[PDB]
Design an enzyme around this catalytic site. Structure first.
Site, PDB file in Angstrom:
ATOM      1  N   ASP A  95       0.753  -1.246  -0.037  1.00 21.19           N
ATOM      2  CA  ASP A  95       0.063  -0.229  -0.006  1.00 21.19           C
ATOM      3  C   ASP A  95       0.903   1.133   0.114  1.00 21.19           C
ATOM      4  O   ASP A  95       1.743   1.421   0.781  1.00 21.19           O
ATOM      5  CB  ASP A  95      -1.109   0.005   1.073  1.00 21.19           C
ATOM      6  CG  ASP A  95      -0.239  -0.182   2.326  1.00 21.19           C
ATOM      7  OD1 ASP A  95       0.287   0.936   2.974  1.00 21.19           O
ATOM      8  OD2 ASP A  95      -0.392  -1.069   3.076  1.00 21.19           O
ATOM      9  N   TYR A  96       0.436   2.294  -0.868  1.00 22.19           N
ATOM     10  CA  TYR A  96       1.208   3.562  -0.786  1.00 22.19           C
ATOM     11  C   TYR A  96       0.555   4.241   0.488  1.00 22.19           C
ATOM     12  O   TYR A  96      -0.529   4.282   0.703  1.00 22.19           O
ATOM     13  CB  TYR A  96       0.641   4.488  -1.991  1.00 22.19           C
ATOM     14  CG  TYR A  96       1.253   3.843  -3.401  1.00 22.19           C
ATOM     15  CD1 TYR A  96       2.480   4.574  -3.489  1.00 22.19           C
ATOM     16  CD2 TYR A  96       0.642   3.448  -4.432  1.00 22.19           C
ATOM     17  CE1 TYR A  96       3.210   4.163  -4.566  1.00 22.19           C
ATOM     18  CE2 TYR A  96       1.300   3.236  -5.496  1.00 22.19           C
ATOM     19  CZ  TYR A  96       2.479   3.406  -5.600  1.00 22.19           C
ATOM     20  OH  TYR A  96       3.090   3.201  -6.979  1.00 22.19           O
ATOM     21  N   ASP A 125      -5.345   2.160  -3.365  1.00 21.13           N
ATOM     22  CA  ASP A 125      -3.851   2.535  -3.038  1.00 21.13           C
ATOM     23  C   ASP A 125      -2.904   1.475  -2.695  1.00 21.13           C
ATOM     24  O   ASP A 125      -1.849   1.450  -2.167  1.00 21.13           O
ATOM     25  CB  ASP A 125      -4.001   3.469  -1.963  1.00 21.13           C
ATOM     26  CG  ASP A 125      -4.302   3.081  -0.576  1.00 21.13           C
ATOM     27  OD1 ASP A 125      -5.140   2.156  -0.402  1.00 21.13           O
ATOM     28  OD2 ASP A 125      -3.763   3.878   0.394  1.00 21.13           O
TER      29      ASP A 125
HETATM   30  N1  LIG Z   1     -12.687  11.948  -0.208  1.00 19.31           N
HETATM   31  C1  LIG Z   1     -12.500  10.877   0.405  1.00 19.31           C
HETATM   32  N2  LIG Z   1     -11.428  10.144   0.071  1.00 19.31           N
HETATM   33  C2  LIG Z   1     -10.997   9.157   0.856  1.00 19.31           C
HETATM   34  C3  LIG Z   1     -11.953   8.698   1.914  1.00 19.31           C
HETATM   35  N3  LIG Z   1     -11.410   7.507   2.426  1.00 19.31           N
HETATM   36  C4  LIG Z   1     -10.483   7.205   1.687  1.00 19.31           C
HETATM   37  N4  LIG Z   1     -10.197   8.156   0.729  1.00 19.31           N
HETATM   38  C5  LIG Z   1      -9.158   7.973  -0.345  1.00 19.31           C
HETATM   39  C6  LIG Z   1      -7.952   8.994  -0.062  1.00 19.31           C
HETATM   40  C7  LIG Z   1      -7.195   7.867   0.641  1.00 19.31           C
HETATM   41  C8  LIG Z   1      -7.340   6.762  -0.453  1.00 19.31           C
HETATM   42  C9  LIG Z   1      -6.969   5.377   0.450  1.00 19.31           C
HETATM   43  O1  LIG Z   1      -8.005   5.058   1.281  1.00 19.31           O
HETATM   44  P1  LIG Z   1      -6.933   4.611   2.744  1.00 19.31           P
HETATM   45  O2  LIG Z   1      -8.240   4.338   3.681  1.00 19.31           O
HETATM   46  O3  LIG Z   1      -6.058   3.893   2.478  1.00 19.31           O
HETATM   47  O4  LIG Z   1      -6.423   6.057   3.272  1.00 19.31           O
HETATM   48  P2  LIG Z   1      -5.003   6.281   3.430  1.00 19.31           P
HETATM   49  O5  LIG Z   1      -4.554   7.669   3.584  1.00 19.31           O
HETATM   50  O6  LIG Z   1      -4.005   5.531   2.951  1.00 19.31           O
HETATM   51  O7  LIG Z   1      -4.916   5.490   5.097  1.00 19.31           O
HETATM   52  P3  LIG Z   1      -4.133   4.250   5.566  1.00 19.31           P
HETATM   53  O8  LIG Z   1      -2.828   4.894   6.064  1.00 19.31           O
HETATM   54  O9  LIG Z   1      -5.041   3.678   6.444  1.00 19.31           O
HETATM   55  O10 LIG Z   1      -3.885   3.124   4.526  1.00 19.31           O
HETATM   56  O11 LIG Z   1      -8.604   6.680  -0.651  1.00 19.31           O
HETATM   57  C10 LIG Z   1     -13.080   9.516   2.558  1.00 19.31           C
HETATM   58  O12 LIG Z   1     -13.679   9.398   3.177  1.00 19.31           O
HETATM   59  N5  LIG Z   1     -13.177  10.599   1.555  1.00 19.31           N
HETATM   60 MG   LIG Z   2      -4.086   3.376   2.533  1.00 19.66          MG
END
Ligand SMILES: Nc1nc2c(ncn2[C@H]2CC[C@@H](COP(=O)(O)OP(=O)(O)OP(=O)(O)O)O2)c(=O)[nH]1
Ligand SMILES: [Mg+2]
Length: 639
Positions: free
Chosen positions: A396-397, A589
């Site tokens: 995962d990125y 991701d």
């Molecule tokens: N607009 C929006 N984008 C979201 C939401 N949840 C996730 N995303 C988008 C942005 C991050 C991407 C990947 O989701 P993740 O849940 O892995 O987010 P992350 O920032 O990588 O978190 P993690 O470190 O938990 O893996 O998807 C949300 O509630 N709203």
């Molecule tokens: Mg993520």
DNA sequence: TTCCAATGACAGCCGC
DNA sequence: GCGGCTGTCATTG
């Protein structure tokens, strides 16, 4: 005038066709499937009813070359042209030589690649062009293309060829759709001609829009990686699923019995009217909507709203996850395990990939059920297992959308935080719940994640209020504080909206365009929605471009070190232990691979290296790799 | 209609 | 009475 040349009707016509075909740099094929080892064609995996009986080739004009794949029974088959001889010449014309540019045009490339491999034992090895993907690339918000919509938009003078061919207005390939009274030969021949000519026009439009490099280097290779994923499927333990189902069903029974005693009578948990009657008329609670956010407030005042919320959560896991997985699972007799074979869907607003039948992306995160005061962990992901001896690898990125937003806004504060700060969602959760980073549960970190992306993508004080459980004015202050901390982000929001209003579109890192004519709209909602889509499309669309490039670059590397089969289907379609890494799932991701024990170190290195090198940004693309005996039990793995 | 993206069951309504 | 449409409400990222 439309002509069908039956190339297998005469040895001499056949060789003339083969000689001409071997000269072509570009051609279309369409598979001919009809309803009924057989003399009359090749069985299709999943359907005891339909046969591949042939295919049609087109390389210009209104000439279809129909290539029969029937042993016996248009003029008849020249019997000196054995099916084995035809299959040789077919594999020869569909596989690349060294330093030979050749492009094959296939409507629904993925489905055709799989039938050719599994039904006919033929592996396409050329450059691929799907006019469905070209349509998407020209307008990602367009309706999913049919052969009828493609011909309507790009080849309208040939609409008469589709007269009385009503299945051309369905999603499935005209040649593949045996639910017609028209012969596979006629359907495949018409399709071959419509798709070859359509793709010439779609190629001219891609060139005018400067999307042809994207199409050839990213989108069509991405489709090839998704074909391997669909051939691979994902391993599934029916036993793990059933035991979770039984615990969930027992909790649903206890929740119902307790709900009905509090209510005083039966009520349907599926009827908003019934729930409103009980909560507001019968229990006289303060309010009539029965949404998550309403019941989330009210659970502080009475046990019933909490029971409703848990009922819907568990009913979701049983009816939308367990029931479809149990219905769709399929024995793989080679691996000696059950698998699920989902269908990829790349026609999305922002260039994400999703799945159907079933949508494995929506398998719940781990959650807890309490019964008689004992907690039970429900990990639905734990039912997704590798082949015996194998491992699941997830890469995962880290915060990909935040890293892209930093890069595009040059925000020095956001860059610092990502470079050496801890988890930003933990920082938000800690400040908010008056705690240090360490105490945060999964559900609370997800609440903080929703807050952070919500604010960035234009969430208002009213909504943030409900999520944070604070007054609008308090939420409004918190948005101001956030916006003030990251001033680069806010400049990029206004600079993206200004540029969208001017151009009528936004662009991703690879040049893909999304048209947002709502941006000009006088209506305040439609305008604000478009502005939010403008900002979000650039960041989310860019992230989806990076993951596609990563996927494609990993697949190239895996196939260099590839002593062995590019997918589990390449063993099915073949008819020596498993080696290598098999693409089993994309999660926006995150990439999941099923990997042989001996290959996990090398595949982990390749996956991480290729994901970190996908593109060069102002900030490092950090990748975490995990490994485990199931999707549900992944452990950190230092690569 | 006021985070974005996605799939998909399900009430309830209405034109046919 | 049947099928299409339109919200509601779920879950995932
Ligand atoms: N607009 C929006 N984008 C979201 C939401 N949840 C996730 N995303 C988008 C942005 C991050 C991407 C990947 O989701 P993740 O849940 O892995 O987010 P992350 O920032 O990588 O978190 P993690 O470190 O938990 O893996 O998807 C949300 O509630 N709203
Ligand atoms: Mg993520």
């Amino acid at each position: 005038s439309l002509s069908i040349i039956d190339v297998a009707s005469d040895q001499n016509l056949f060789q003339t066709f083969i000689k001409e075909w071997r000269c072509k740099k570009r051609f279309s094929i369409s598979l001919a499937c009809e309803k009924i080892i057989r003399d009359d064609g090749f069985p299709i995996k999943g359907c005891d009813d339909t046969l591949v009986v042939g295919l049609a080739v087109c390389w210009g004009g209104r000439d279809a070359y129909y290539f029969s794949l029937q042993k016996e029974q248009p003029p008849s088959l020249d019997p000196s042209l054995t099916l084995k001889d035809r299959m040789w010449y077919l594999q020869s014309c569909l596989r690349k030589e060294s330093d030979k540019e050749c492009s094959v045009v296939i409507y629904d490339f993925i489905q055709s690649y799989k039938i050719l491999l599994l039904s006919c034992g033929i592996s396409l090895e050329q450059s691929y062009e799907d006019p469905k993907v070209a349509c998407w690339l020209l307008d990602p918000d367009s309706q999913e293309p049919t052969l009828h919509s493609i011909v309507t938009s790009f080849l309208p003078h040939e609409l008469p060829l589709l007269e009385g061919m009503e299945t051309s207005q369905g999603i499935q390939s005209l040649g593949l759709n045996a639910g017609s009274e028209h012969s596979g030969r006629y359907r495949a021949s018409v399709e071959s001609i419509l798709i070859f000519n359509s793709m010439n026009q779609l190629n001219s439009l891609l060139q005018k829009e400067n999307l042809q490099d994207v199409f050839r280097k990213v989108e069509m290779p991405s489709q090839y990686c998704l074909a391997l994923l669909e051939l691979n499927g994902i391993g599934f333990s029916t036993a793990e699923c059933e035991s979770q189902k039984h615990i969930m069903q027992a909790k649903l029974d206890a929740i119902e019995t307790q709900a009905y005693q509090l209510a005083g009578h039966s009520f349907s948990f599926t009827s908003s009217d019934d729930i409103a009657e009980v909560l507001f008329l019968e229990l006289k609670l303060p309010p009539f909507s029965t949404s998550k956010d309403v019941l989330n407030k009210l659970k502080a005042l009475h046990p019933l709203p909490g029971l409703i919320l848990e009922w819907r959560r568990i009913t979701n896991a049983i009816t939308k996850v367990v029931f479809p997985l149990q219905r769709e699972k399929c024995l793989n007799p080679f691996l000696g395990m059950e698998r699920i074979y989902p269908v990829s869907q790349s026609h999305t607003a922002t260039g994400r990939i999703t799945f159907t039948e079933p949508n494995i992306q929506n398998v719940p995160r781990d959650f807890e059920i309490k019964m008689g005061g004992m907690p039970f962990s429900i990990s639905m992901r734990h039912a997704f297992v590798p082949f015996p001896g194998g491992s699941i690898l997830a890469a995962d990125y880290s915060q990909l959308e935040l890293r892209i937003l930093a890069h595009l806004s040059h925000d020095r504060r956001l860059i610092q935080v990502l470079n050496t700060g801890a988890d930003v969602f933990r920082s938000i959760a800690a400040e908010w719940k008056m705690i240090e980073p360490e105490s945060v549960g999964d559900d609370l970190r997800q609440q903080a994640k929703q807050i952070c992306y919500g604010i960035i993508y234009g969430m208002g004080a009213k909504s943030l209020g409900e999520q944070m459980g604070i007054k609008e004015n308090d939420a409004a202050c918190y948005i101001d504080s956030f916006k003030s901390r990251y001033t680069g982000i806010n400049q990029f929001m206004t600079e993206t909206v200004k540029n969208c209003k001017r151009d009528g579109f936004v662009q991703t890192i690879l040049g893909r365009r999304r048209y947002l004519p709502g941006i000009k709209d006088n209506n305040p909602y439609r305008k604000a929605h478009a502005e939010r889509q403008a900002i979000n499309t650039i960041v989310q669309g860019s992230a989806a471009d990076i993951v596609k490039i990563a996927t494609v670059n990993i697949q190239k590397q895996l196939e260099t070190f590839h002593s062995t089969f590019k997918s589990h289907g390449h063993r099915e379609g073949m008819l020596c232990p498993i080696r290598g890494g098999f693409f089993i799932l994309q999660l926006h991701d995150e990439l999941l691979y099923e990997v042989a024990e001996e290959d996990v170190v090398q595949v982990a290195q390749i996956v991480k290296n290729e994901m970190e090198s996908a593109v060069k940004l102002s900030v490092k693309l950090k990748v975490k790799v995990k490994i485990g005996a199931s999707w549900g039990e992944l452990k950190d793995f230092d690569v």
